[PDB]
Amino acid sequence: FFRTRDRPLRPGDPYPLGSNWIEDDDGVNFSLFSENAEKVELLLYSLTNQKYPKEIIEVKNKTGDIWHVFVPGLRPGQLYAYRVYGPYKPELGLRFNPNKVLIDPYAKAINGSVIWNDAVFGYKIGDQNQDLTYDERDSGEYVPKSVVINPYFEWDDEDFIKGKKVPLKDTVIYEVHVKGFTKLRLDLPENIRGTYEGLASEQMISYLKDLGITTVELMPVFHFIDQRFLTDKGLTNYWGYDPINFFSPECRYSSTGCLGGQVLSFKKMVNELHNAGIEVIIDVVYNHTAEGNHLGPTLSFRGIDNTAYYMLQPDNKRYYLDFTGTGNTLNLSHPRVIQMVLDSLRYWVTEMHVDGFRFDLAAALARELYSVNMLNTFFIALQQDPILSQVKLIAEPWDVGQGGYQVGNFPYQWAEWNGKYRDSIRRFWRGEALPYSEIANRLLGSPDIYLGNNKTPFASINYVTSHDGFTLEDLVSYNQKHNEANGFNNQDGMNENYSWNCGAEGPTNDQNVVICREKQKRNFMITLLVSQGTPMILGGDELSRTQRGNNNAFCQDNEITWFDWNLDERKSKFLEFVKKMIQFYRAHPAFRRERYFQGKKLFGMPLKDVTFYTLEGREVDEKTWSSPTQLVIFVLEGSVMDEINMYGERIADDSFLIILNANPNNVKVKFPKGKWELVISSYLREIKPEERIIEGEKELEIEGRTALVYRRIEL
């Protein structure tokens, strides 16, 4: 018979955010923001018994709207969680249920996932008055425990890879899933297959640099939950765009456990990548939490302080404003939420040494109540911060809310996923005829999109594929989505795919169809790596990866998603193509430009820096410029580029001739003045000796669906 008073403790300062092993004082400083709770309890578990608390501590100290208490003796690896006391008024938004044990939103390591059970919900599940009850079941047995971590780490040879790393000018992105990257890589030992350590192994570092990409984009690594309706169908969250914490790397990708080993194996991973000169960007979800809407679980934020953290219908405060399509939306108007997002953004930069972030549904971070405000408080603080000012910032420039398409409205420093490029480049090769404006504007870095806010071609992240939608193989292998394996009877996944199946649907034996897709794949790869701006490859597309027509494989944790690494000759031959095409875009500054092309001659030169042609060697007039086309031809003159490097030197390259013929039928093109030599084609054919060099405004037949590049050797 004691009181919580007879246990040695110290006040505590909200210095950090959650766990903080203070070596000098031998103990831990705990912290958890809550302006609306009435009582807060620290729960400590032992690694043996993890169902009932080894000790129950009541945080009696509060400084403003923050509770804290320093527990002596504690040490890294210690397991802990919280119970939050307060009023229960769901009709008013107060959903406090201290029966529910919650995870520290500042935990840098979370132990498990959730054993799904009707007791982790805060409301009696079966009750007719759903969400309005108060289910008094203890949920402690079912919620993963938070880990006190040791933040120390020796970053060997990485202290110097800071600075002029890989400029956005010469960046080539390679978006990967951590597990699918290496799960069927029996190249490496098991148990590292499909984890952080697997990605950073010597075999993969070599493959990534043999291929030639500069930076890798890792799909969500913020510790996430498999939502119940997937588990109740035998599924898991493969993508991870459903996170529960913003500081802990996901446990399932750890090769050394989840008791702190995941932050170590993560730090070791990018340390290894850095040593090879490979930047690292992480896909980050700050727009929604896995807790879902009402009727969703009460796992942390809902229990801690629900009014905050979450955007609620202002007249009701019971239901949740949903701009992500996933039940809730993080209320990024509250100062403590804004501090959390930036504190975690700083944590991953200075502690996990990541180089950039590509924000999922980034527009949802700008919504204030029903409005999109790209000059809101959160964005401004991000623009001013000394540390975050130096990392790369990339946005998915939209959310699924009303008025959420926000392409070209993100501030300076920001780059954007250029969905307009993706859709209309896909439609151009489909056979469709867009205006000559549409294709030419995408090809030159989208000046019509991004110049209005004074941003450069870097802002445009050009891509033909993504985790969203088809793979490159599947874009030329299906006309309709085939997401039956998801278990929602194909009511999921977007329907307009701008896709063509080359004739058939699915895998085929009719070689002409097969040969048509290899031509289409090569047309997609040639276009993207010759168009101004930053190109992003989807991981595995160089291997012709296939998801069997699943354009929404977020639930598939299996062979549909894995990288398949053993190649026949068709796959192997295409891999070498993407290799040599990647090598091209990086050897020639005429496409890694910091400035746009305009339509004049410069520096007292007789040649225009860029010229647009039609089928016969004639400059594009004003009305043929807005008339549709299936054929685009333009000349890039490298020696009249207004391109200046950081030393004040101008930059010169070749004069290039890009001929992109999306016409299904043949055409004969009369070249412009000069002698031209052929640099690659989408031809899988033995390339004609007549097509190898062109001279003196002669003409030449160009087979349908074919892309070509020419380099003037003489004038």
Q: Which of residues 45-64 bind a copy of itself (CB under 8 A)?
A: 62-64
**325, 335, 452, 506: which one contacts a copy of itself (CB under 8 A)?**
335
Instruction: Using CB under 8 A, count the residues that bind a copy of itself.
Output: 79
Reported in sequence order, the residue ranges of 477-563 that DSSP labels E, i.e. its strands, are 534-538
CB atoms within 10 A of CB 354: 22
- Judging by beta carbons within 10 Å of its beta carbon (0-12, 13-18, 19+), is residue 491 exposed, middle or buried? exposed
For 209-241, b where at least 16 C-beta lie within 10 A, e where not — what string? eebbbbbbbbbbbbbbbbbbebbeeebbbbbbb
Q: Which one-letter DSSP state was computed for residue 144?
A: P
CB 16 within 8 A of CB 2: no
Of 571 and 588, nearer to a copy of itself (C-beta) is 588
Of 570 and 675, nearer to a copy of itself (C-beta) is 675
Q: Which one-letter DSSP state was computed for residue 181?
A: T
| Window contacting a copy of itself (CB under 8 A); options: 78-86, 114-122, 189-197, 578-586 | 578-586
Site for a copy of itself in 584-623 (CB under 8 A): 584, 586-589, 601, 603-607
Residue 65 touches a copy of itself, criterion: CB under 8 A? yes
**75, 89, 162, 580: which one contacts a copy of itself (CB under 8 A)?**
580
Of 14 and 194, nearer to a copy of itself (C-beta) is 14
Site for a copy of itself in 251-290 (CB under 8 A): none
| Window contacting a copy of itself (CB under 8 A); options: 288-296, 319-327, 375-383, 496-504 | 375-383
CB of 685 to a copy of itself, least distance (A): 12
Question: Which residues, other chains included, contact 576 with Cβ-Cβ below 8 Å and sequence gap of 6+?
Answer: none
Round to whole Å and give the CA distance between 379 and 375.
6
CB of 379 to a copy of itself, least distance (A): 8
Residue 346 touches a copy of itself, criterion: CB under 8 A? yes
| Window contacting a copy of itself (CB under 8 A); options: 162-170, 321-329, 449-457, 546-554 | 449-457
**386, 664, 689, 696: which one contacts a copy of itself (CB under 8 A)?**
386
Q: CA distances (Å), 243 to each of 64, 113, 212, in order? A: 28, 11, 31
**160, 647, 664, 689: which one contacts a copy of itself (CB under 8 A)?**
647
Round to whole Å and give the CA distance between 181 and 164.
28
- Positive or negative, the CA dihedral 203, 257, 173, 157 is negative
CB of 709 to a copy of itself, least distance (A): 9
- Identified catalytic residue from 396, 416, 541, 542: 396
Round to whole Å and give the CA distance between 423 and 496.
10
Answer yes or no: 396 catalytic. yes
Round to whole Å and give the CA distance between 661 and 657.
13
Of 299 and 338, nearer to a copy of itself (C-beta) is 338
CB of 639 to a copy of itself, least distance (A): 4
Residue 713 touches a copy of itself, criterion: CB under 8 A? yes
Read off the tokens for 252. Answer: 């399932």
For 563-583, b where at least 16 C-beta lie within 10 A, e where not — what string? bebeeeeebeebbebbeebbe
- Judging by beta carbons within 10 Å of its beta carbon (0-12, 13-18, 19+), is residue 200 exposed, middle or buried? buried
Of 126 and 648, nearer to a copy of itself (C-beta) is 648
CB of 457 to a copy of itself, least distance (A): 13
Of 126 and 715, nearer to a copy of itself (C-beta) is 715
Site for a copy of itself in 505-544 (CB under 8 A): none
CB 265 within 8 A of CB 195: yes
Element (H, E) at 158: none
CB 107 within 8 A of CB 146: yes
Give Cα 189 to chain centroid, integer Å. 28
Reported in sequence order, the residue ranges of 551-642 that DSSP labels E, i.e. its strands, are 610-613, 628-629, 631-637
Q: Which one-letter DSSP state was computed for residue 115?
A: -
Residue 653 touches a copy of itself, criterion: CB under 8 A? yes
CB of 659 to a copy of itself, least distance (A): 14
* Helix residue ranges per DSSP H, 529-630: 569-587, 622-625
CB of 44 to a copy of itself, least distance (A): 13
CB of 655 to a copy of itself, least distance (A): 5
Binding mask 24-43 for a copy of itself (x = CB under 8 A): --------------------
Residue 651 touches a copy of itself, criterion: CB under 8 A? yes
Site for a copy of itself in 72-111 (CB under 8 A): none
Site for a copy of itself in 392-421 (CB under 8 A): 411-413
Answer yes or no: 26 catalytic. no
Q: CA distances (Å), 240 to each of 226, 381, 421, 487, 674, in order? A: 8, 27, 26, 18, 54
Residue 1 touches a copy of itself, criterion: CB under 8 A? yes
Site for a copy of itself in 454-493 (CB under 8 A): 454-456
CB of 18 to a copy of itself, least distance (A): 16
Binding mask 208-247 for a copy of itself (x = CB under 8 A): ----------------------------------------
CB of 366 to a copy of itself, least distance (A): 13
**48, 128, 129, 384: which one contacts a copy of itself (CB under 8 A)?**
384
Reported in sequence order, the residue ranges of 219-308 that DSSP labels E, i.e. its strands, are 279-284
- Identified catalytic residue from 104, 360, 416, 438: 360
CB 213 within 8 A of CB 582: yes
Residue 712 touches a copy of itself, criterion: CB under 8 A? yes
Of 100 and 592, nearer to a copy of itself (C-beta) is 592
Closest CA to 632 of 606, 657, 600, 651: 657
Residue 700 touches a copy of itself, criterion: CB under 8 A? no
**102, 439, 640, 707: which one contacts a copy of itself (CB under 8 A)?**
640
CB of 332 to a copy of itself, least distance (A): 11
Catalytic residues: 360, 396
